[PDB]
């Protein structure tokens, strides 16, 4: 029914991401679902218009534990338990949370 070209290639770019997980997740564990959604939506993200890298953040989500802070380093924050202001302070080092 749709003829425009431009209109065509978006159902059919969608359509891609929603066949390739629906064929795919289908054959993975329930547990997995999540791990092939995320990395689509990474792949969109990346291909999309419009939107920043947001490479930083995702870095940072990946491997957040890297971030090395010594030994009492890390001051306690009221009411957020040690492993809790132990990840505050590994997530500053952003500059968005530079302020957290």
Do not use: W
């Not at 534990?65 to 924050?77: F, N, R």
């Amino acid at each position: 029914g749709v003829t425009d070209h431009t209109q065509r290639l978006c159902i059919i770019t969608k359509d891609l991401f929603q066949v390739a997980f629906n064929r795919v997740a289908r054959g993975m564990l329930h547990q997995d679902h999540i791990t092939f959604a995320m990395l689509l939506a990474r792949i969109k993200l990346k291909g999309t218009v419009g939107e920043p890298t947001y490479e930083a953040e995702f870095q940072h989500f990946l491997r957040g534990k890297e971030i090395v802070l010594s030994a009492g380093s890390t001051p306690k924050i009221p009411g957020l338990t040690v492993e809790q202001a132990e990840a505050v302070v590994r997530l500053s080092c952003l500059p968005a949370f530079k302020d957290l």
